[PDB]
Amino acid sequence: GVKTLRTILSSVTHNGKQLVMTVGLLAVVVYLYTVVAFNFFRKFYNKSEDDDMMTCYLFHMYVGVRAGGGIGDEIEDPAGDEYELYRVVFDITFFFFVIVILLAIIQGLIIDAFGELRDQQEQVKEDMETKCFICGIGSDYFDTTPHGFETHTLEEHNLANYMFFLMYLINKDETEHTGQESYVWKMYQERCWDFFPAGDCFRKQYE
Amino acid sequence: NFLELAESILEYFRPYLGRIEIMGASRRIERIYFEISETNRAQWEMPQVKESKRQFIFDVVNEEKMELFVSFCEDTIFEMQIAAQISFWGELEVQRVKFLNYLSRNFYTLRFLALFLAFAINFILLFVYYFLEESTGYMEPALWCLSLLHTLVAFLCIIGYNCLKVPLVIFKREKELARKLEFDGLYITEQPGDDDVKGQWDRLVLNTPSFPSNYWDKFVKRKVLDKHGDIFGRERIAELLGMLMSIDVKYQIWKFGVIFTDNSFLYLGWYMVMSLLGHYNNFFFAAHLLDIAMGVKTLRTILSSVTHNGKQLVMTVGLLAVVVYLYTVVAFNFFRKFYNKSEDDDMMTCYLFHMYVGVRAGGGIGDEIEDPAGDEYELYRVVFDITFFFFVIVILLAIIQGLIIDAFGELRDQQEQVKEDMETKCFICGIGSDYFDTTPHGFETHTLEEHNLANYMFFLMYLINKDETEHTGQESYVWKMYQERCWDFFPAGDCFRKQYE
């Protein structure tokens, strides 16, 4: 519906190939962690009052989704002696590394991409101002006059001025084409497009 | 007009020839013309050539340019030759050769397939002993067969691929060493510096029955020995290189060490060992295969962005640990009591607790501790908790985020920078500005016709073949300059158009 809204949406959705690949990576890392937990911290869970690899992976994923937090925290805490130090180490690593990094990347992608889009758009706006698009020499050079570059822009070249010209060329007959140097017409029908200038504006030309 | 009469022949000979480059050449800047071997041209096109070019460009962006370029073109020629080559004892040898040639193609396909096999094995594993564990009864046998097939494949593909990567890599090292000897002395110029490593290992190997093996040259090496000693007496020189049932030694040992050093080879080997484990006990094998597979460059790109300036990231995490222990000590000395609860520690125990509570799971250090209604001593306890909850965690998070995020943005900008600069200044060339522009797409012309980059590579390749007379026809002077080496001639400074006029 709304373009600005549309713009935000576009910024949000981009280089998400990418975003998707990262989410996939996250899933892979998580299953891997669950398998390791499964083989070294067996027990824990199976609790309330009084799993197979698949069940365990499912649990880790679900606990994680609802809702972030700490994988270690959800699991029953171990007072040891065990085997307790190893369990704690595992939990700390998981809580501080996958989640934090995942979040950071998601954020950067959402952010860096965003900044990038804005910069690129701004770039487009500025460049247009700097080099005459007609034209090819959008520098002040047009400047060593009173707003002389400004004049080239209004009088130019003409862009839209050219479009009117094309319509006029379309209508006028053979004689009209001859009057207009039709040569322009032959060039168009070439098509061939050379004539459009590029290189030199009148002012440079003289002199 | 005369030129105009002749057109069909010209177009054809046209994709065929390039033009050349211009060199200083005893003043002025003439531009030579040579007839480009087509086969080389066809070979040059392709995935690998393009990848190499992109890599060279990236390296240039990262930042002697002319020398680097020459090295790059060379290596490339060597690679092309190698690819072309790749394309009852005697029968056995022929068979081995055919297998090795396949193995190439065998290598990429294998890597792709290897990833697939690993993936399947891992999925299946995910699916007192292990029941193995529902589904069709045949699943256990299928799993064993898949593992046997995959491990063998990794074991076999890994060796062939590594082998090819290996002559390609060794050649470069040998060339570098040769270049160093000709114009400098390790211990001889002024003893190799006591630095890696590597350079030191090379210095040790340096004396071999055959040194210019795989490279192309040799007598040149003897000649180099001759140039010095030659103020070195014959003896130091002899002392250096001097000079089946029987095999060269030192060379083989050195080769093995060099192969061992490369990261890619180590990676492949590591993955294969993972296959032994993958047998041994299934979970380890599946995990190894999975870690090993990825794989995707874009994914690779994201991973690279993620891992960077993490020295850095690591130093910050270390700082966090230090701050936390410090806080725990302070809490230990002023808010004693609290904790030691459920129903009815030493500095070390306390630090451990803070760290664990913090890991599982973030939140508030103060929140985990029993809340104090006072009177106490309660205000002080609250102050301590607030400071800790709002300052270390928030700041730590912010820095981690910036570093990852800033780093990411930076990598992207830097890459883009590389892309733009290439567009703006002709790399040939050195004056990549519109100036080439005051013509109809005149800069564009310099780019297509140029200069030629690749045009120069083709030319160098041609120069390698033509003999002495051919060199004379070609001004050989270019050849002497190359053999100098000396590289001046490559221009830099002026393109034809500026030159006239």
* Cα–Cα dist B487/B478, whole Å: 9
Handedness of CA B282, A52, A23, B305 (dihedral sign): negative
- Comparing CA positions, the residue from B46, B162, B167, B160 lying closest to residue B101 is B160
Specify whether the CB–CB gap between B20 and B27 falls below 8 A: no
Elucidation method: cryo-EM
* Cα–Cα dist B72/B77, whole Å: 9
User: What's the per-residue H, E or C state across B330-355?
Assistant: HHHHHCCCCCCCCCCCHHHHHHHHHH
Please count the other Cβ atoms lying within 10 Å of the Cβ belonging to residue B331.
23
Count CA atoms closer than 13 A to B331's CA, side-chain side.
29
Tell me whether the omega of the peptide bond preceding residue B198 falls within 30 degrees of 0, making it cis.
yes
Specify whether the CB–CB gap between B451 and B473 falls below 8 A: no
Q: Which residues from chain B sit within 8 angstroms of residue A96, using beta carbons?
A: 359
And the tokens for B62? 């990262």
Specify whether the CB–CB gap between B22 and B63 falls below 8 A: no
Burial class (CB in 10 A: 0-12, 13-18, 19+), A47: exposed
How close B305 gets to chain A, by Cα (Å)? Answer: 9
User: Rounded to the nearest 5°, which phi and psi values hold at B69?
Assistant: -60, -45
Give the bridge partners for B22, in sequence order.
Answer: B31
And the tokens for B297? 């460059």
* Cα–Cα dist B228/B237, whole Å: 8
- Comparing CA positions, the residue from B81, B120, B87, B84 lying closest to residue B103 is B87
Distances, alpha carbon B355 to alpha carbons A46, A96, A102, B98, B364, in Å: 26, 11, 21, 60, 12
* Cα–Cα dist B32/B25, whole Å: 11
* Cα–Cα dist B412/A57, whole Å: 35
Cβ–Cβ gap B127/A54 under 8 Å: yes
State the amino acid at position B188 in one-letter form. I
State the alpha helices, DSSP H only, in B127-191: 139-183, 187-190
- Comparing CA positions, the residue from B177, B164, B31 lying closest to residue B87 is B164
**Residue A176 C-alpha from the chain's centroid:** 50
And the tokens for B68? 């680097």
Tell me whether the omega of the peptide bond preceding residue A157 falls within 30 degrees of 0, making it cis.
yes
Q: Which residue has the tokens 């040939």?
A: B428
Distances, alpha carbon B372 to alpha carbons B205, B245, B332, B377, B381, in Å: 72, 85, 16, 9, 8
Tell me whether the omega of the peptide bond preceding residue A127 falls within 30 degrees of 0, making it cis.
no
- Comparing CA positions, the residue from B198, B197, B180, B202 lying closest to residue B189 is B180
* Cα–Cα dist A100/B87, whole Å: 49
Please count the other Cβ atoms lying within 10 Å of the Cβ belonging to residue B256.
10
Specify whether the CB–CB gap between A152 and A130 falls below 8 A: no
And the tokens for A181? 């140097």
Out of B283, B299, B359, name the one closest to residue A25 (CB): B299
* Cα–Cα dist B283/B286, whole Å: 5
* Cα–Cα dist A9/B80, whole Å: 48
Residue B123: closest C-alpha in chain A? A54
State the amino acid at position B500 in one-letter form. Y
A42, A43, A52, A187: best to mutate for the B interface, most B CBs within 10 A:
A52
Specify whether the CB–CB gap between A121 and A127 falls below 8 A: no
Q: Which residues from chain B sit within 8 angstroms of residue A28, using beta carbons?
A: 290, 294
Phi-psi label, residue A80: left if phi above 0, alpha if psi -120 to 50, beta otherwise:
left
* Cα–Cα dist B187/A39, whole Å: 55
Q: Which residues from chain B sit within 8 angstroms of residue A72, using beta carbons?
A: 359-361
The dihedral over CA atoms of A50, A52, A58, A59, expressed in degrees to the nearest 10, equals 30
* Cα–Cα dist B20/B18, whole Å: 6
B422 is in an annotated binding site: yes
Long-range CB pairs of B381-388 (<8 Å, 24+ gap) are B381/B335, B381/B338, B384/B330, B384/B331, B384/B334, B384/B335, B388/B327, B388/B364
- Comparing CA positions, the residue from B342, B292, B347, B340 lying closest to residue B325 is B347
Out of B127, B359, B409, name the one closest to residue A112 (CB): B409
State the amino acid at position B325 in one-letter form. Y
* Cα–Cα dist B365/B361, whole Å: 10
- Comparing CA positions, the residue from A47, A39, A36, A35 lying closest to residue A75 is A47
Distances, alpha carbon B346 to alpha carbons A82, B328, B329, in Å: 20, 11, 10
Specify whether the CB–CB gap between A112 and B405 falls below 8 A: yes
* Cα–Cα dist B275/B285, whole Å: 6
**Residue B204 C-alpha from the chain's centroid:** 26
Specify whether the CB–CB gap between B20 and B459 falls below 8 A: yes
- Comparing CA positions, the residue from B50, B110, B115 lying closest to residue B286 is B115
Q: Which residue has the tokens 């700041």?
A: B395
Give the bridge partners for B438, in sequence order.
Answer: none
Tell me whether the omega of the peptide bond preceding residue B485 falls within 30 degrees of 0, making it cis.
yes
**Residue B70 C-alpha from the chain's centroid:** 19
* Cα–Cα dist B71/B65, whole Å: 10
* Cα–Cα dist B39/B19, whole Å: 17
- Comparing CA positions, the residue from A160, A124, A148, A130 lying closest to residue A201 is A148
Classify residue A134 by its DSSP letter. T
State the alpha helices, DSSP H only, in B199-249: 199-205, 219-227, 233-239
SS3 B31: strand
State the amino acid at position A100 in one-letter form. V
Q: Which residues from chain A sit within 8 angstroms of residue B127, using beta carbons?
A: 53-54
Residue A30: closest C-alpha in chain B? B287
User: Rounded to the nearest 5°, which phi and psi values hold at B231?
Assistant: 85, 0
Handedness of CA B444, B445, B451, B457 (dihedral sign): positive
SS3 A153: helix
A154 is in an annotated binding site: yes
Cβ–Cβ gap B360/A72 under 8 Å: yes
Residue B411: closest C-alpha in chain A? A112
Give the bridge partners for B18, in sequence order.
Answer: B34
* Cα–Cα dist B292/B155, whole Å: 13
Specify whether the CB–CB gap between B188 and B228 falls below 8 A: yes
Biggest CA-to-CA distance, chain A: 103
Out of B296, B356, B438, name the one closest to residue A21 (CB): B296
Q: Which residues from chain A sit within 8 angstroms of residue B438, using beta carbons?
A: 199-200
* Cα–Cα dist B338/B347, whole Å: 15
- Comparing CA positions, the residue from A3, A2, A17, A10 lying closest to residue A117 is A10
State the amino acid at position B336 in one-letter form. R
* Cα–Cα dist B59/B63, whole Å: 6
Tell me whether the omega of the peptide bond preceding residue B118 falls within 30 degrees of 0, making it cis.
no
And the tokens for B367? 């929140």
* Cα–Cα dist B76/B394, whole Å: 51
Cβ–Cβ gap A92/B442 under 8 Å: no
State the amino acid at position B134 in one-letter form. E
List gaps in chain B by the residue before each (C–N > 2.5 Å). Answer: 63, 87, 127, 243, 344
Q: Which residues from chain B sit within 8 angstroms of residue A25, using beta carbons?
A: 294, 299, 302-303
* Cα–Cα dist B68/B60, whole Å: 9
Q: Which helix (H) or strand (E) holds A78?
A: none
And the tokens for B105? 């193609």
- Comparing CA positions, the residue from B264, B224, B256 lying closest to residue B240 is B224
Resolution of this deposited model, Å: 4.9
